[PDB]
């Protein structure tokens, strides 16, 4: 077997695809040490998917594959501003060249989203079984995030269809039965049907799985706080930690506990 000499993947320099990762998943204006930290889970991904055949998708714990941007769309997003955001993202990678997340020598899911409620979540595996580095830590940083309250409106036919329930006389819509270690909804009750908050989440398409509703005429009103599954790294958190002076290393120990840095060399 001809083996290749260089890490290459999909006919790119390995660097080279982080650098497009990156780009593609976290906005170029984020402050340097959080685009570092972004570059480790990407890597962490890249360096898995290439160990166990080659195959495309990410071993996330998390429900997922998404768009890799390229440099057409990359110049719409970043306007006139692409040159000096291409070269940020580019030394935030070489910066950290080769280095990925691991925990008990294995990488990890280094699973990530946007911005947080106030706590990520913990997670576990199908059979319940914790993942230790994936724990509910408090992310206060993105109280202050633009995407951190939001509202869905729907009418009250389309959301008893998508949920195929009928909604409480209360006006109350559904009742929220508790709450998660990251303060996520855990399940909702209707007359006769119940509902994981994950589930009503994707059936809604909402912006996170910590919602509070209400009624209003004949339409429901929706109230989410955070984007995203919350789960592992908070974009905006690690953003909100760098700009008070966090480097990338006790970002990613935030977030992922008992994370160990590794250089991808040993594999």
């Known amino acids: 077997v001809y083996r290749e000499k260089q890490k290459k993947v999909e006919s790119l320099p390995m660097e080279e695809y982080v650098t497009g990762v990156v780009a593609s998943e976290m906005n170029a204006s984020f402050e340097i040490e959080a685009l570092k930290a972004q570059a480790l889970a990407a890597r962490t991904f890249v360096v898995q998917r290439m160990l166990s055949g080659g195959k495309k998708n990410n071993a996330d714990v998390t429900d997922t594959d998404q ?8 110049k719409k997003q970043w306007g006139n501003n692409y040159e000096n955001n291409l070269k940020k993202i580019e030394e935030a990678v070489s910066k950290t060249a080769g280095q990925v997340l691991t925990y008990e020598g294995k990488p990890i899911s280094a699973s990530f989203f946007s911005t947080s409620n106030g706590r990520t979540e913990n997670a576990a595996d199908y059979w319940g079984n914790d993942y230790p580095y994936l724990k509910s830590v408090d992310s206060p940083w993105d109280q202050a995030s633009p995407k951190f309250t939001s509202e869905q409106i729907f009418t009250v036919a389309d959301f008893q269809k998508r949920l195929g329930v009928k909604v409480l006389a209360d006006g109350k819509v559904g009742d929220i039965k508790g709450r998660t270690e990251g303060k996520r909804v855990k399940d909702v009750a209707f007359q006769g049907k119940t509902l994981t908050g994950r589930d009503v989440r994707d059936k809604l398409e909402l912006r996170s799985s910590d919602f509070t509703w209400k009624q209003e005429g004949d339409k429901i009103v929706v109230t989410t ?4 599954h919350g789960v592992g790294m908070s974009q905006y958190g690690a953003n909100g930690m760098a700009a008070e ?9 935030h977030y992922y506990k008992g994370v160990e840095i590794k ?5």
Do not use: H, P, Q
Request: no cysteine; charged share 35%; proline share 0%.
């Open 245 to 253: 002076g966090k480097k990338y290393t006790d970002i990613v120990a």
């Open 263 to 267: 250089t991808m060399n040993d594999y």
């Open 67 to 74: 768009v890799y941007k390229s440099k057409e769309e990359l």
């Open 225 to 228: 706080k955070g984007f995203g």
